[PDB]
Design a protein around this ligand. Structure first.
Ligand SMILES: Nc1ncnc2c1ncn2[C@@H]1O[C@H](COP(=O)(O)OP(=O)(O)O)[C@@H](O)[C@H]1O
Ligand SMILES: Nc1ncnc2c1ncn2[C@@H]1O[C@H](COP(=O)(O)OP(=O)(O)O)[C@@H](O)[C@H]1O
Ligand SMILES: Nc1ncnc2c1ncn2[C@H]1O[C@H](COP(=O)(O)OP(=O)(O)O)[C@@H](O)[C@H]1O
Ligand SMILES: [Mg+2]
Ligand SMILES: [Mg+2]
Lengths: 524, 524, 87, 87
């Protein structure tokens, strides 16, 4: 294909125009005051959205070069959401400010490489300062309002989340279930979870979040990389007698064909899934038979001693519910029985004494807590099930935030945290002035999220930013109530996890943007 | 896809042009004098319509941005019809007036957010005042002319509706049936209804209102979310022996495939339907076996104790007629027999004493009245059945209005009600003047429906609006007879239900329109 | 109308501060909060008594600027129609 | 330059008020009422200048802060006297 080659300022000017168009649309929707963006939908009334992610995914530009600049910022903003579940608009507000000023400095003939180093040095220092700024919210009492604040300042969703982590503070998995009673129901089931993606991108089922809630499927568990269609078809034939969905847990399938192919064949037919087992080698294999002991299943392949093909519905695990997604496999409640599952407890307690490897010891002491801790199951018993269905997303909204908050503590929400780092590290100086200019570009960019939010509020951003900069600690503007106060006390706070991720991702995209010598795109 | 990005006044000016084009066409058809709009039809003479809904659905604009502005007003006008069955043109007359003036205020640099708050504050106050304005029409004597007025001022259709609600005043379901006698026939059959939509949008049958009148089908009733094509095909084979249509009542089907698919497969073949059971959990399940007791059927699935597949035509409910639509399931007369149906009456009377939950008590006392109240069946015995078929739509016309009227009472029809709220709340003032301007924009907009109607009448709107504003209570212009009088006495009135819905929906679309910072549409 | 004139009178200070690069509104608030000749020395980017710092403007020039601006501006706001040669 | 900046602000604020539906002529009368009062207050604020130190300072500020220009004009101011003309 013919490729259009662009160079120097020619390419950079095109890239900035694309960054600006995407940032402008995402920036208006920052904070409680974010103005709605009308997104054309192909049939039906155009969607009106106050959410940055929907607008960003929508934005595509017709200029090949301008689109490439927009796409690069979008992927880093999405990466911020992957690390912590929000920060998508904040990442683009920060990225646009660093990128626009940095590109202008490069257009002044300044060395791009140390401009990049100076911005990165300031970012690393700011990240350490943010951790110092952090308020540990480990205690359940802190979790109680942290969770209420986390759920878009809603007490009802927050308290249920807080009630369960009252159950497990930290690592206990908590899941959201539609309530079967009009009173809310919470129980802890000693099920399981592991952070392993599904073996095709296309396994998505009914919940609009790329995920696979699955009611009473049976589970295959395999100890060699499975020979595919010839011996999986017997099992699929057996599975299709009963009518239940199947999940493959394995090393992989012999996957170049059928791990790609099976989800394109089987969605409309039967619904069948596949996932990687956790860790590698003996740990993966041992962990698969740990998984087996907990589900009630046994592990199966031609290779070791326990042939696959003629397997029945008894020769499987089963779980009352399963969740599976791009990045996670979750077992909500096995068919396995208390005594058999506790065939494990004697060994796992024993090996913790003595294991000759430090990470084997760590894995064993992680595994026993995990195995016994289980999954906290929250049933949202709202009077209206459509409304608990609606609040169900906010509850998933909340635990993403609450989990991030417990992991890194909390910072003064509002860009007050970035203002105090900016004021805190004004002293930091670059070795050369290209480096010095880079430090300043990063510091000025840190002010941009607070200023954009006050602009959406209609307050002129400068008076407020001057007052917030002048103020002490968590003194900040609550734009929803339009007055200054202590933000943490007022109830505006976010995890140090979220702010740190947005700043780091914004810095990386900006550095690449400043140092991009040439852009090659397909000819229009 | 390449997306055209618009910003600030650039987008708003495009959106206003689209709102204006749609509003202009809908506004001319307001009231008895509404001038006809010729709607091109692809083959045959162009339809001439004095109905706003037909014109609004028709209007589509070629500019991507202009169409998006029109579509947003259309969906809110349709939402007004969904809440109460009319108000579609009135919503657009009100929406255009708030949107045009509000956009002009935003174009004056005024803060969009409080303009929005000021309009909304005035609307909330006006809604309370409208309820104070309300005349309770609960009494059957009030229903008698309320119904006559409701049926486009026709006494014949109104009296039959009034005669049946003489039967049940309020909650008793009343249905319209083609008369089998030349004398009108009215009977009350203790059948059933529940406000649950059908499980595909495409289930539509013979009546031109998206609905499913169905003569003697048999009914499936299921107590688990059904395993689909493999065990539904036996039943479908059994059903297709007899030749009757089938309805699935269930939690759902295992629906991602066959609940979407079945209506695309089975329309031309056999005609088969599916609906959600009412409520959730024990209440849904109990209510399904309440439904079972009343129809004469029993509830069926693999899961609890009563396998599906080999079921006969006896192992079903049956009803003489059924109605099903986007939002409702109706059972007109079971096959069930008096004594068996009254297997229920002892329990339902008993549990009302003692139930330990307040909403369980409410559901029980709602359920007994509902179960015994039944469906009032009106047979329109006109001398001409084509004419009773024609009047049949007006009778459906009437009960939509009569039901709304009994629920909220009635207000001086004619925009006289909105004039008196506007005059009543002239005192209301915004905290800031952006808020003050918003209150005034809402108040001036309230006058627009009366003025548009007098303009269609050919009276200049100002003299009449000045006189109506000056006059007392229900003093208003009867544009059909072209003279002022007491509107309620003259026979021009509408439910508080209808006016309140139109004002609320118009305010919501206007606020979004004023605060829309950016519009993203697919490139032309 | 009186308010429009008073708000406009703050405009020269804001524009000098904008040319300096400091935030005009923040400086305007400090000067408005201050009293007497307290003002922002644009060259030294500091706040001090203007007479003491030597920043003095002739009264005739300031008075003339206000009167001339008000007369032309007041007529311009009243314009409702413009008639000009077709391009 | 200051007259243009003041005029631009009065027109921008006035046009926004006319857009709100405020009668344009009434705003013009209000602007004029404020200006007449402001001119009197400038006369009260004014303190006379004839010190050659002050004469140099008004010259320096008027010359984009050129100290030499103000210094020389004060001396020429001094030598010619009030009836004198400086070119
Ligand atoms: N009531 C408020 N007062 C001040 N700012 C707020 C308030 N609530 C949230 N914020 C801040 O505004 C941002 C939330 O805006 P949001 O629309 O969710 O964009 P994003 O997805 O990038 O976080 C966060 O930075 C949050 O800290
Ligand atoms: N005889 C009449 N006198 C005055 N106005 C009337 C008369 N009859 C109805 N109206 C008013 O005119 C409106 C009915 O117009 P219509 O064409 O049905 O549009 P819409 O569907 O929005 O109600 C209602 O607001 C009604 O109150
Ligand atoms: N350091 C200073 N502080 C503030 N303003 C200054 C300073 N020095 C000179 N000025 C000038 O700024 C304005 C001068 O305007 P100028 O640009 O010289 O053109 P003109 O006098 O025709 O309006 C005056 O307010 C004057 O005070
Ligand atoms: Mg957010
Ligand atoms: Mg109508």
């Amino acid at each position: 294909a013919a490729k259009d080659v662009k160079f120097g300022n020619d390419a950079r000017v095109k890239m900035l125009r694309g960054v600006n168009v995407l940032a402008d649309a995402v920036k208006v929707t920052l904070g409680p005051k974010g103005r709605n963006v009308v997104l054309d939908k192909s049939f039906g009334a155009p969607t009106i959205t106050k959410d940055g992610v929907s607008v960003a995914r929508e934005i595509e530009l017709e200029d090949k070069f301008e689109n490439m600049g927009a796409q690069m910022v979008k992927e880093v903003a999405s990466k911020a959401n992957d690390a912590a579940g929000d920060g998508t608009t904040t990442a683009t507000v920060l990225a646009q400010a660093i990128i626009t000023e940095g590109l202008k400095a490069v257009a002044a003939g300044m060395n791009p490489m140390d401009l990049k180093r100076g911005i990165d040095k300031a970012v690393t220092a700011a990240v350490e300062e943010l951790k110092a700024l952090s308020v540990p919210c480990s205690d359940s009492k802190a979790i109680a309002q942290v969770g209420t604040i986390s759920a878009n300042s809603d007490e009802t969703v927050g308290k249920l989340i807080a009630e369960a982590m009252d159950k497990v503070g930290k690592e206990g998995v908590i899941t959201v279930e539609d309530g079967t009673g009009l009173q809310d129901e919470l129980d802890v089931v000693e099920g399981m979870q592991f952070d392993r993606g599904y073996l095709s991108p296309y396994f998505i089922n009914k919940p609009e979040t790329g995920a696979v809630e699955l009611e009473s499927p049976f589970i295959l568990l395999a100890d060699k990389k499975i020979s595919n269609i010839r011996e999986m078809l017997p099992v699929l034939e057996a599975v299709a007698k009963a009518g239940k969905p199947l999940l493959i847990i394995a090393e992989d399938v012999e996957g170049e064909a059928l791990a790609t192919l099976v989800v394109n064949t089987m969605r409309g037919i039967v619904k069948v899934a596949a996932v990687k087992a956790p860790g590698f080698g003996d740990r993966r294999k041992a962990m698969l038979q740990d998984i087996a002991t907990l589900t009630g299943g046994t592990v199966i392949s031609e290779e070791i001693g326990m042939e696959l093909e003629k397997a029945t519905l008894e020769d499987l695990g089963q779980a009352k519910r399963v969740v599976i997604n791009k990045d996670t496999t979750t077992i909500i409640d096995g068919v396995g029985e208390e005594a058999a599952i506790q065939g494990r407890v004697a060994q796992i307690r024993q090996q913790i004494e003595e294991a000759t490897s430090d990470y084997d010891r760590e894995k064993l002491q992680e595994r026993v807590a995990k195995l016994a801790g289980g999954v906290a199951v929250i049933k949202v018993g709202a009077a209206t099930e459509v409304e608990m269905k609606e609040k169900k997303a906010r509850v998933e909204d909340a635990l993403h935030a609450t989990r991030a908050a417990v992991e890194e503590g909390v910072v003064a929400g509002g860009g007050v945290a970035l203002i105090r780092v900016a004021s805190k590290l004004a002293d930091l100086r670059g070795q050369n002035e290209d480096q010095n200019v880079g430090i300043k570009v990063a510091l000025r960019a840190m002010e941009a999220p607070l200023r954009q939010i006050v602009l959406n509020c209609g307050e002129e951003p400068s008076v407020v930013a001057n007052t917030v900069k002048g103020g002490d600690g968590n003194y900040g503007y609550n734009a929803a109530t339009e007055e200054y106060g202590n933000m943490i006390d007022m109830g505006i706070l976010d995890p140090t996890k979220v702010t740190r991720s947005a700043l780091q991702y914004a810095a990386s995209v900006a550095g690449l943007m400043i140092t991009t010598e040439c852009m090659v795109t397909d000819l229009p």
